[PDB]
Amino acid sequence: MLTEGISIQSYDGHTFGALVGSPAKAPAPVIVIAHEILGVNAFMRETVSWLVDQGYAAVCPDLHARQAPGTALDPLDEAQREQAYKLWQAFDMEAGVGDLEAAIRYARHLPYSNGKVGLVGYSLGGALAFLVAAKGCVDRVVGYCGVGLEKQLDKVPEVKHPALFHMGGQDHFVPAPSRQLITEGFGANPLLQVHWYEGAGHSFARTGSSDYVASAAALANERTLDFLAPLQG
């Protein structure tokens, strides 16, 4: 689901929609949400609503629009999961970072903006979140369960603003050697935080997922809100 009429244009003229949640009160910091491989779906709607309840405005851009505009896949359906994996396989990460940078610029100039923008990414979005953190166009970044962070360690010293990452300790995408590499690499830059949730799998924060772990999701989400709160005012 997207908000009708919202259009954001990227570096290369590509335009895309977004689900936008205006804040309860103005002004407010704006949070750009980088979605999972499944697109702007029920979990994204939930995430928008949550952040609005917590004193933010939120913008979730349609990152699949270069291939398939309005993608919103339900992870309960095998056919829709398969669609999502096909989209991820072909997904252009660099164009995703560009689209997110455009959404951040858009977020900054919303009429209720207090001038501060954050970025929260989930899964696909968590990997994009790290790449955006390295680019530095955003005030604070949060990434949940990003894949392949261990291959982006050269970018650790490029991060010049705070970034916080939540990772499952039983995430099959991040086995022990990868966790050790990420832990040691990210540890070199005190602007970064990486928290591991022992006993939690890849989609531990996604309500409805068989991976969901309430205690882990609760602690991660509490840390996220405390990390974003400094943007408020």
Side-chain angles (χ1 to χ4, degrees):
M1 75 295 291
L2 303 172
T3 300
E4 198 189 349
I6 299 288
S7 179
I8 298 159
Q9 184 172 58
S10 199
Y11 61 102
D12 69 343
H14 172 65
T15 69
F16 53 89
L19 177 63
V20 177
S22 60
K25 279 258 205 287
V30 188
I31 305 306
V32 171
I33 300 157
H35 62 63
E36 318 160 276
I37 64 176
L38 300 151
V40 191
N41 66 0
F43 179 59
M44 292 294 111
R45 191 191 272 204
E46 166 194 328
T47 304
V48 173
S49 287
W50 170 56
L51 292 166
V52 168
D53 293 345
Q54 300 296 142
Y56 302 92
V59 174
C60 185
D62 182 20
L63 302 177
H64 285 316
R66 295 165 178 277
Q67 294 314 317
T71 294
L73 297 165
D74 185 334
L76 286 172
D77 183 346
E78 182 180 294
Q80 290 183 65
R81 290 195 308 276
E82 287 174 356
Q83 214 157 329
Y85 287 121
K86 178 166 185 290
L87 293 174
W88 183 19
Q89 182 131 355
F91 189 83
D92 181 336
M93 293 290 282
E94 295 64 34
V97 167
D99 284 354
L100 284 170
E101 283 174 324
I104 287 166
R105 285 191 299 267
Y106 172 86
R108 214 179 280 287
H109 298 321
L110 287 169
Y112 42 71
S113 176
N114 79 343
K116 292 305 218 309
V117 182
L119 179 139
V120 177
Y122 292 83
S123 192
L124 173 58
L128 293 168
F130 183 64
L131 300 174
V132 173
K135 276 272 216 275
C137 45
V138 62
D139 297 304
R140 305 206 163 193
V141 166
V142 181
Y144 287 74
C145 308
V147 176
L149 291 187
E150 76 286 352
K151 302 162 78 74
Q152 302 297 334
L153 299 174
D154 288 340
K155 302 187 184 303
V156 162
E158 296 175 20
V159 174
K160 297 195 182 322
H161 302 294
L164 161 64
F165 294 88
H166 306 288
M167 303 287 275
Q170 295 185 358
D171 191 335
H172 190 30
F173 285 114
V174 194
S178 297
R179 169 179 179 165
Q180 172 56 20
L181 278 167
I182 289 154
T183 299
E184 180 168 8
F186 278 47
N189 183 346
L191 293 165
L192 298 171
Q193 292 180 56
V194 184
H195 290 290
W196 308 83
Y197 296 82
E198 307 295 358
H202 182 69
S203 293
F204 80 87
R206 184 173 77 216
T207 344
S209 173
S210 55
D211 282 9
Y212 184 79
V213 179
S215 65
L219 177 56
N221 286 338
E222 167 174 304
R223 287 171 170 167
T224 293
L225 290 180
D226 289 345
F227 180 82
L228 300 172
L231 302 183
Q232 295 183 328

